């Protein structure tokens, strides 16, 4: 019969009319033959039933035949078969509520799984199709959880509680805090003052955050090299550590890991781990630095690219004027015997020029 679904605490309207359309007697009673609410002229009445003061009917719409049932603050335990005994007939209506919910709530950063458990009348079965704000028609049973949340899954989802030839949609909001970059990469040359940047997405909250950046310098296994920082609102500050190079950091939230001069030994990978709280987790975002050193020995020259280079790239040295004085696939090429010209060292991959470092020859 009439199988209408509802949401917890939401409300729903049970229909009930008939021919004759005039203000006549009517009475809503649940399968337990208890009278939800009834009438006696304009005077609207209710029953002893648990539903009592949360049920209501529209007296205005009464004149036009409707003897509607409005249930406010939907209690899960409202799931029943109500009957609207109007002028010589009975209307059977089963109202099955539901309630989609995530327990892992407040301040979700990356990865940290999301879980969606469901409430439903003891004896009926749902199915949930959680459509994401972007793609993935993730679906499951009385429960379905999103694995490790990746940025783009931030927003407003739309899970659907299917039950019967009826279905009830649900709008849950899920925002993934995180970095706006995976592997940042900077290509510089022996000297060029290096800068790095990893942004977030504003937020407030109390006593909330600090971590540090770790670096794997090329060859220099001499690790444990780092910089530590504490954050609070639009305030950042180095906890301590740095040492080794003169890395300077900002006072302002949009973090700028600064590297005074791009010296050759400062090339390699790095992980900048951020970890705040309320209900913690730890963000990560990769960092990498490459260096190029164009320097003529004596009357003969050479140049080299250190750091995270690809076994797909090429290096080349030419005097600009004419074409390839030496082309190759490695990080330490040489050009013995150069001629006057403002020479260009080139690091790339495929075609688009990565690193370019100019230098002149004398005779």
UniProtKB/Swiss-Prot annotation:
Domain Ig-like C2-type spans what residues?
Answer: 101-178, 179-292, 293-349
Q: How is it modified after translation?
A: Palmitoylation and association with LCK contribute to the enrichment of CD4 in lipid rafts.
* Expressing tissues: Highly expressed in T-helper cells. The presence of CD4 is a hallmark of T-helper cells which are specialized in the activation and growth of cytotoxic T-cells, regulation of B cells, or activation of phagocytes. CD4 is also present in other immune cells such as macrophages, dendritic cells or NK cells.
Stated name of the protein:
T-cell surface glycoprotein CD4
Q: Which GO terms describe its biological process?
A: adaptive immune response; calcium-mediated signaling; cell adhesion; cell surface receptor protein tyrosine kinase signaling pathway; cell surface receptor signaling pathway; cellular response to granulocyte macrophage colony-stimulating factor stimulus; cellular response to ionomycin; defense response to Gram-negative bacterium
Can you state the subunit structure given in the record?
Forms disulfide-linked homodimers at the cell surface. Interacts with LCK. Interacts with PTK2/FAK1. Binds to P4HB/PDI. Interacts with IL16; this interaction induces a CD4-dependent signaling in lymphocytes. Interacts (via Ig-like V-type domain) with MHCII alpha chain (via alpha-2 domain) and beta chain (via beta-2 domain); this interaction increases the affinity of TCR for peptide-MHCII. CD4 oligomerization via Ig-like C2-type 2 and 3 domains appears to be required for stable binding to MHCII and adhesion between T cells and APCs. Interacts with Aedes aegypti long form salivary protein D7L2.
The residue spans the entry assigns to the Extracellular side of the membrane are as follows 1-363
Q: Which residues of the full protein are shown?
A: 26 to 388 of 458
Q: List the disulfide bonds.
A: 16-84, 130-159, 303-345
Question: Function of this protein?
Answer: Integral membrane glycoprotein that plays an essential role in the immune response and serves multiple functions in responses against both external and internal offenses. In T-cells, functions primarily as a coreceptor for MHC class II molecule:peptide complex. The antigens presented by class II peptides are derived from extracellular proteins while class I peptides are derived from cytosolic proteins. Interacts simultaneously with the T-cell receptor (TCR) and the MHC class II presented by antigen presenting cells (APCs). (Microbial infection) Primary receptor for human immunodeficiency virus-1 (HIV-1). Down-regulated by HIV-1 Vpu. Acts as a receptor for Human Herpes virus 7/HHV-7.
User: What mutagenesis or variant effect is reported for residue 240 to W?
Assistant: In OKT4-negative populations
Annotated ranges, domain Ig-like V-type:
1-100
Q: What is known of its domains?
A: The Ig-like V-type domain mediates the interaction with MHCII.
* Organism annotation: Homo sapiens (Human)
Give a GO molecular function annotation for the protein. extracellular matrix structural constituent
The protein's gene is named CD4
Task: Enumerate the UniProt keywords alphabetically.
Answer: Adaptive immunity, Cell membrane, Disulfide bond, Glycoprotein, Host cell receptor for virus entry, Host-virus interaction, Immunity, Immunoglobulin domain, Lipoprotein, Membrane, Palmitate, Phosphoprotein, Receptor, Repeat, Signal, Transmembrane, Transmembrane helix
Outcome of altering residue 40 to Y? Increases the affinity for MHCII
Which cellular component terms (GO) are annotated to the entry?
Answer: clathrin-coated endocytic vesicle membrane; early endosome; endoplasmic reticulum lumen; endoplasmic reticulum membrane; external side of plasma membrane; membrane raft; plasma membrane; T cell receptor complex
Name the glycosylated positions.
271, 300
Identify the disorder associated with this protein.
Immunodeficiency 79: An autosomal recessive disorder characterized by childhood onset of recurrent and recalcitrant skin warts due to uncontrolled viral infection with human papillomavirus (HPV). Some patients may also have recurrent respiratory infections. Laboratory studies show a complete absence of CD4+ T cells.
Query: Which topology term describes how it sits in the membrane?
Result: Single-pass type I membrane protein
């Amino acid at each position: 019969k009439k199988v209408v679904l509802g949401k917890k605490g939401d409300t729903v309207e049970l229909t009930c009319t008939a021919s004759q359309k005039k203000s006549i007697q009517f009475h809503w009673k649940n399968s337990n033959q208890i009278k939800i609410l009834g009438n006696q002229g304009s005077f609207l009445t209710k029953g002893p039933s648990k539903l009592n003061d949360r049920a209501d009917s529209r007296r205005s719409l009464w004149d036009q035949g409707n003897f509607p049932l409005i249930i406010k603050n939907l209690k899960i335990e409202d799931s029943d078969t109500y009957i609207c005994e109007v002028e010589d007939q009975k209307e059977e209506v089963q109202l099955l509520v539901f309630g989609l919910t995530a327990n892992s709530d407040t301040h979700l950063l990356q990865g940290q799984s999301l879980t969606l458990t469901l409430e439903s009348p003891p004896g009926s079965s749902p199915s949930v199709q959680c459509r994401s704000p972007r793609g993935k028609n993730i679906q499951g049973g009385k429960t379905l959880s999103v694995s490790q949340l990746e940025l783009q899954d931030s927003g407003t989802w739309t899970c659907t509680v299917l039950q019967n030839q009826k279905k009830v949609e649900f709008k849950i909001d899920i925002v993934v805090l995180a970095f706006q970059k995976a592997s940042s990469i900077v290509y510089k040359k022996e000297g060029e003052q290096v800068e790095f940047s990893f942004p977030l997405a504003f937020t407030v909250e109390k006593l909330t955050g600090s971590g540090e950046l770790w670096w794997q310098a090329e060859r220099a296994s001499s690790s444990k090299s780092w910089i530590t920082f504490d954050l609070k609102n639009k305030e950042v500050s180095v906890k301590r550590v740095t040492q080794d190079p003169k890395l300077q950091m900002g006072k302002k939230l949009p973090l700028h890991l600064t590297l005074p001069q791009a010296l050759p030994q400062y090339a390699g990978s790095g992980n900048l781990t951020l970890a705040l709280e309320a209900k913690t987790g730890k963000l990560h975002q990769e960092v990498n630095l490459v260096v190029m050193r164009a320097t003529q020995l004596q009357k003969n020259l050479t140049c080299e690219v250190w750091g995270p280079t690809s076994p797909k790239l090429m290096l080349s040295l030419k005097l600009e004027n004419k074409e390839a004085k030496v082309s190759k696939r490695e990080k330490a090429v040489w050009v013995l015997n150069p001629e006057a010209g403002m020479w260009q060292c080139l690091l790339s991959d495929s075609g688009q020029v990565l690193l370019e470092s100019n230098i002149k020859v004398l005779p």
